[model samples]
Target: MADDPSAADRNVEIWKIKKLIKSLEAARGNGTSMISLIIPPKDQISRVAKMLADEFGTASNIKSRVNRLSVLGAITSVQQRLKLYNKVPPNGLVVYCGTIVTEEGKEKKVNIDFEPFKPINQFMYFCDNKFHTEALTALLSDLE
Candidate 1:
C-alpha cells in the first residue's frame, strides 16, 4: 500500500494528525488556563468571536493574579487568530492555546489551530488544565 502514491500521502497525513493529538494530550497547565475551541462548519465566526470577547471580560474577575493573566493572554491570542478568518472552513476549526508548565519549571505558550479532516457537528469552548481531545479522538477512530 505504501507504494501507491495516494496511500502514501494518506498515511503521512494520519501520522501528522496522530502526532498532534499526542503532543496536545501531554501538555499540562498550572491551572485551568488551557483553552480548546471547536467551531462547527455551520457556526458563524462572528458569534464565537463575540463570545470570546465576553469571556475576556469575565476572566478579569478571576481571583488568582497569575491565573487571571494566563487566561486573558490565551483568550487574546485566540481572538487575534479568529480575526483572520472570514468564515469557518468547510470541515470546521479546532484551536488550542495555553501556557504549559515545562519540566524545568518554565512557562511555555502554545497556540495551535487547524481544520479537521472530517466535518465537525458540535461546537465547544472549554478551559481546563488539560486540552480537550475527545472530539479529535473520535475523528481518529472513524478513520479506521
Candidate 2:
C-alpha cells in the first residue's frame, strides 16, 4: 500500500476490520439474556458477516473485500494466531438467520422453525427434553 495513492484509506479499512473483530469477541464473551431456540446452520459464517455489517457499520464500506465465509476464516485466523478462544464463552452461541430462494424466484429470510421439530425430537430427549422444549416454545411463540 506504500506505493498506492489510497494507502491512507486502506489503513482506515484495516482499522475498521480490527475493531469489528474485537466487538464480536466482546459480544461472544457476554451471553444473551435468556435461553432461546436458535438456528445453528452455517452459524459461524453468518455470525461473522453480520458482525462486520452490524456491529461495526462497515458492510457497505468493505462489502466486496469480505463475505460470510471469508469473515469466518478471519475470525478463526485471529483465534489461532492470538489464542483468543478463552475470550468467548463455551456455549455463548446465538442463532443464525438463513435465507431461501425458491424456484418461483421469491426471496425471504428464515429461521429454524421449532414448531414442527418439537414433537419429533421430543421423545429423543426423554431425559432432559422438558426444559429444552419450554425454552424453545417461549422463543418461537414470540416469533410467530
Candidate 3:
C-alpha cells in the first residue's frame, strides 16, 4: 500500500539504466579501442575536453596503423559527443564510443551517452575491449 510517487519514479529510472547496462555489457571492440568516459557532477567539462585533446595528440604516437586509427576515431567521437554538453547534469554524464565488431564480421562505430539517475562520484576515462560498467553497476547496487 506504500505508493510514494518519488520512489516509483526512481524505479522506472533504475529500469532504464539496467537496460542500458545490458547493452553496454554486450558491446565489444577490437583490442583496446573502446572508449568510456565518466564525468562526475562536480567535474568541469572543460577539463575533460582538454584531456581528450591531449589524448588525441598522444594517440598519434601509436605504431599500428589500424589500431591507431581506431583509437583516434573513438577519441574524436567521444570529443564530438562531449561538445553537445555545455555543463554536467546534477547526476553526471557517461559516454561510450568506439568501433564495434558486428556479428556479420563488419566494424561499426557506436556512440552512447546519458546522464545517470543518481550523482556519480568518480571520474574515469578508459580505452579497452569493452565498455567499463563498474561505476554504473555500483550506482545500481546502492539503490537496491
Candidate 4:
C-alpha cells in the first residue's frame, strides 16, 4: 500500500478486520448448522451480490471475497453450504410478457425425514426428482 499514490493519507482500519477475524474464529455459535434453500438459484445470488456492491461500492472483489468467506470455511460450509449445483428453471414453457410471464406451474409433496441430521452429512436441494412423474406433477401444481 505504501507504493500507491494515496497510501500516505489512506489509513487502513486493522481493528475492524481484527473483529471480523475474532467473530469467525469463535469456537461455536448459534445457527451454525442450518442449510438454506436458495430459491431461483443464480438469480438470487446475483441479486444479493448487487446489494453488496450497492452498499460497499469501493471493492469489486467484495462479492467473491464474501462468497469465499461465507461458503468456504470450517463452520461455514457446514451450516451455510447446500449441495445444489448448476441448474436451470425446469418450467419449460419459457416466455416472458412485460416482465411477467405465465410459466408452467409446479406442485410438490415431500415426506422428508424431520429427524435432525448432521448438516455435514447427507442433504439435498432440489425442486423434485426430475425423473419421477409424480414429483413432476407436483412441480406443475406448485406454481398455483
Candidate 5:
C-alpha cells in the first residue's frame, strides 16, 4: 500500500478509503459534497477501506486520487465542496466527500483523535467514560 503509511499493519481505514471511492462511482450520483461519519455504527470502515485498496488500487493510489481531486480545486483537506474527511461534533471523524479546509491550510498533522470513526474504530468514545474524562479530555485536547 502507501509507503508513507504502510497498510501492511496500519489501521484498516487506509484500505477502506478505496472502497468509498468505488461506492462513489457506483452510486451513480454526482454531488459536490460528501461526508463520512465513522460512528453511529452505519459505515463499516475497516471492511470498506480494505475493499478500496485491494479491489480498486493501493493505498498510495487512493491517496493520490484524493490528492488529485484536491489539486483540481475540487477538494481540500478540511474545507472543500467534496471533503474526504473532517472532524465531527464532540469528537468524531467526518469524512468530506468534497474538499478539505484545514484549520491551518496545511494538512493536519499529529491530530486525528477527532475522527468520529475513532470512537467506533479505536477506543470507542473513551472520553465518555465516567472514570476516564480527565484522561480522555487531556488526550483529545492535545490532539489539535
Candidate 6:
C-alpha cells in the first residue's frame, strides 16, 4: 500500500496544511475583525502557501518533478502575499493562483502566469509608518 513514496509524502503534507488552515480561520474570526500586533502569525502564511503548493504541485504527471522547482517558486509568491497582510490596508483578502509554463520552443526556465487576487490591495491607509486607515481609526474610536 505504501509503495509510492512521493504520493504518500504529498498526502501527509496536504493533511498537515488542512489542519492548520482550520485554526487560522478560527483565529481570524468573523472576517472583519482586525488586531493590533507586531507579527500576524505563521499559520496564516502556511495556510495559503500549502494550498497553493498542493494545487500547483501537480504541474505535470511526473510525481517527483512536480514540487521540486516551480512549486517552490509558487510558494515564494505565497509568502510574499502573506507578508503584505500586516503591511497592507485592513480587511484585505489576497489569493494567489498560477501555473508554470515555458516558451513554445527551446526554454528550460519556466514561466508562471501569476494571478494574485487582492481585494483591497493599494487602498490601505497608514499612520506613522504602520497599518492604519481612517475607517479603522473611526471604527476603533471607543476602544482608543
- Most TM-score-accurate candidate: 1
Evaluated at residue 119, the lDDT of candidate 3 is 78
lDDT of 5: 0.31
Instruction: Please report, as a residue range, the 10-residue window in candidate 2 with the lowest summed lDDT.
Output: 122-131
TM-score of each: 0.82, 0.21, 0.78, 0.17, 0.21, 0.26
The local distance difference test score of each candidate is 0.75, 0.29, 0.74, 0.24, 0.31, 0.33
* Predicted candidate 5 versus true structure: per-residue lDDT over 22-42, tens digit per residue: 433333222222323232234
lDDT tens string, model 1, 37-73?
7677778888777788888898899898677787788
How do the residues 43-138 of candidate 3 rate in per-residue lDDT, one tens digit apiece?
878767778789888888988766677768877887877788978776777887777776688877667777767877767777556677776777
What is the total number of backbone clashes in candidate 3? 0
Q: Of 1 and 3, which scores higher on TM-score?
A: 1
Clashes of each: 0, 0, 0, 10, 35, 1
Q: What is the lDDT for 66 in model 3? A: 69
Model 2 over residues 25-104: C-alpha lDDT tens digits?
23221111111122233234334333433422432344444233333333333223223222322222222222334456
- After TM-score superposition, what is the CA distance of residue 65 in candidate 1 from its true location, in Å? 1.9
Off by over 4 Å in 6: 1-62, 87-91, 95-103, 106-144
Q: Give the poorly placed runs of model 2, Cα more than 4 Å off.
A: 1-55, 62-89, 112-144
Native-vs-model 1 lDDT? 0.75
Model 1 spans > 4 angstroms off: 1-13
Q: Of the pair 2 and 4, which is ahead by TM-score?
A: 2
